[PDB]
Ligand binder design. Structure first.
Ligand SMILES: CC(C)CCC[C@@H](C)[C@H]1CC[C@H]2[C@@H]3CC=C4C[C@@H](OC(=O)CCC(=O)O)CC[C@]4(C)[C@H]3CC[C@]12C
Ligand SMILES: CC(C)CCC[C@@H](C)[C@H]1CC[C@H]2[C@@H]3CC=C4C[C@@H](OC(=O)CCC(=O)O)CC[C@]4(C)[C@H]3CC[C@]12C
Ligand SMILES: CC(C)CCC[C@@H](C)[C@H]1CC[C@H]2[C@@H]3CC=C4C[C@@H](OC(=O)CCC(=O)O)CC[C@]4(C)[C@H]3CC[C@]12C
Ligand SMILES: CC(C)CCC[C@@H](C)[C@H]1CC[C@H]2[C@@H]3CC=C4C[C@@H](OC(=O)CCC(=O)O)CC[C@]4(C)[C@H]3CC[C@]12C
Ligand SMILES: CC(C)CCC[C@@H](C)[C@H]1CC[C@H]2[C@@H]3CC=C4C[C@@H](OC(=O)CCC(=O)O)CC[C@]4(C)[C@H]3CC[C@]12C
Ligand SMILES: CC(C)CCC[C@@H](C)[C@H]1CC[C@H]2[C@@H]3CC=C4C[C@@H](OC(=O)CCC(=O)O)CC[C@]4(C)[C@H]3CC[C@]12C
Ligand SMILES: [K+]
Ligand SMILES: [K+]
Ligand SMILES: [K+]
Ligand SMILES: [K+]
Ligand SMILES: [K+]
Lengths: 242, 242
């Protein structure tokens, strides 16, 4: 029927898109990865030769460094750290900066995610719908001062998304002393609920315990961006769902 | 109105849930984190004292080890690695095992995610609807051999989810030599599109290049679990959306 043809076309398009993306990523990153691996191997070989580090102790040092990486940013299991972890869990971001080490803790986290994901999704959908209604009312008032089409709403939403991304990138560049492009990429990754974890905020000089205002601003910005993303998805994506 | 009261109640419930989760996580993980940090500091101090490692070179060693961690699993930017990265990107998992190192690569990844997320969501929704229809038909045929209620469908979906999770956990425990509970936790994390990245498959002894069958099975299992999760969300969660 129509549904079978539609889903077959969707599957074929998804497979072709995946193949094209994999080919482009390989062709763009193979040489860079090879050069980085060669440089790292040369550096580690030189360091091992200079310090005469035993092979057996090298694995222990690597394990210790890997396990102590989250602890180098301070205490990640305080009230602020626990709140950040809960926010990441409920939003399905998965930064990976801190993970439970207890089986009971893992089970509690699983139950927490199960009981919290639908509630967060419903709240985000409602907030996005309310924001869309408010934006439509504001646009109508502006037009009266100076009917609304779907293209105008789409353009307004895209402009709002771009402005929010630019504001977040500028704020993160000013706070964490990051590059503008890097801050923009990190903001885009955070707002898409992907969570690569390469760039994690509130992980420098113990900012989670000495800068409550920065933490509050980051939480507010994350919530606002998530609401904007949900509103945009409702405006453009949810229409093709049912 | 009703919508304002509903969204205010949702926000209050979400805030209370976040506070409770943060309090429980802190009370459960503070002592464990303190003990782990103390043990790691003692071990690193002992190693530094034994090897007389200079403080300046310690930072260089830490940076080299952190940068070379993905490369220890083999070549992560081959065809299989690029396909895995694209699959993680389109599914918003964000494992974080491999990340782009080029600005052009980052921009391409951002555009890829933007152009692929709605398509993947639509395909998953259609596949979940088709699976729900097939399950309803199978249940009707079974009942005839031996009308259907919503509670029966919910129970069948929950049982299917539990069976899929158990099968995935058993397969991952048999393949990667992981614990049953750890495999179950990793499967749950992967199927919820959260992606902590603590446990990543296809990262041992170069399995991405020597075991094509294992990679294909992992891809099929991930797709099947994502389809099951989408079908369950459509059955129980999507009803409260609109
Ligand atoms: C800025 C961002 C949010 C843009 C997102 C783009 C989407 C609006 C596009 C991208 C992929 C598109 C889909 C790609 C393939 C198809 C299959 C297509 O089916 C057919 O052509 C056969 C069945 C029929 O005749 O309807 C129906 C539209 C649909 C779901 C498309 C709907 C619109 C989608 C989701
Ligand atoms: C309507 C649009 C166009 C503009 C929105 C206003 C912004 C320009 C404001 C609103 C909130 C502000 C932020 C609120 C809180 C903080 C934390 C603040 O941090 C501290 O005070 C402690 C750390 C330090 O000493 O820098 C630094 C500024 C910043 C990011 C502010 C930067 C400027 C922001 C983004
Ligand atoms: C309807 C909307 C606008 C409600 C918004 C609520 C915010 C005003 C609240 C919710 C969560 C709060 C945060 C939750 C946790 C913390 C950690 C907390 O840190 C500590 O308790 C330890 C460090 C210290 O002693 O300050 C400082 C306040 C802060 C950032 C809070 C600041 C105020 C926040 C952002
Ligand atoms: C195993 C998993 C799939 C469980 C998923 C649980 C959901 C089915 C629950 C969890 C939170 C619930 C929501 C929590 C709060 C509210 C607000 C509530 O609104 C009111 O009480 C005021 C308005 C009115 O009177 O209807 C309406 C139901 C709703 C959306 C609930 C609908 C059902 C939800 C999404
Ligand atoms: C209907 C339900 C109840 C059962 C579904 C059947 C499973 C028991 C089968 C179907 C697919 C099978 C998997 C397909 C592919 C592989 C890869 C295979 O790996 C290799 O052959 C190479 C690595 C090695 O040497 O172990 C190991 C078995 C495994 C996980 C299989 C384990 C058994 C599985 C999960
Ligand atoms: C309608 C549904 C059932 C379609 C299912 C398609 C699968 C049969 C395809 C899609 C993606 C394929 C995989 C894409 C990439 C790779 C990596 C590839 O590895 C290499 O090319 C290098 C190593 C080697 O030389 O084998 C081996 C095959 C494999 C696992 C493929 C196996 C077959 C897969 C799972
Ligand atoms: K993630
Ligand atoms: K990570
Ligand atoms: K996600
Ligand atoms: K991650
Ligand atoms: K994620």
């Amino acid at each position: 029927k129509r549904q079978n043809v539609r889903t077959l076309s969707l599957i074929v398009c998804t497979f072709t898109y995946l193949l094209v993306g994999a080919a482009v990523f390989d062709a763009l990153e193979s040489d860079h990865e090879m050069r980085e691996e060669e440089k790292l191997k040369a550096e580690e070989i030189r360091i091992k030769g200079k310090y005469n580090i035993s092979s057996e102790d090298y694995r222990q040092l690597e394990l210790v460094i890997l396990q102590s990486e989250p602890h180098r940013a301070g205490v990640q299991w305080k009230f602020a750290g626990s709140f950040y972890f809960a926010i990441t869990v409920i939003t399905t971001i998965g930064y990976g900066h801190a993970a439970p080490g207890t089986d009971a803790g893992k089970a509690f986290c699983m139950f927490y995610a199960v009981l919290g994901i639908p509630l967060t999704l419903v709240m985000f959908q409602s907030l996005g719908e309310r924001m869309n209604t408010f934006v439509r009312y504001l646009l109508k008032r502006i037009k009266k001062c100076c009917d609304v089409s779907m293209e105008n709403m789409v353009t307004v939403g895209f402009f709002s998304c771009m402005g929010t991304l630019c504001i977040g990138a500028a704020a993160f560049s000013q706070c964490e002393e990051w590059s503008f492009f890097h801050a923009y990429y990190y903001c885009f990754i955070t707002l898409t609920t992907i969570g690569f974890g390469d760039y994690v905020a509130l992980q420098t000089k113990g900012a989670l315990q000495k800068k409550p205002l920065y933490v509050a601003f980051s939480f507010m910005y994350i919530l606002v961006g998530l609401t904007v993303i949900g509103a945009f998805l409702n405006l453009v994506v949810l229409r093709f769902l049912t």
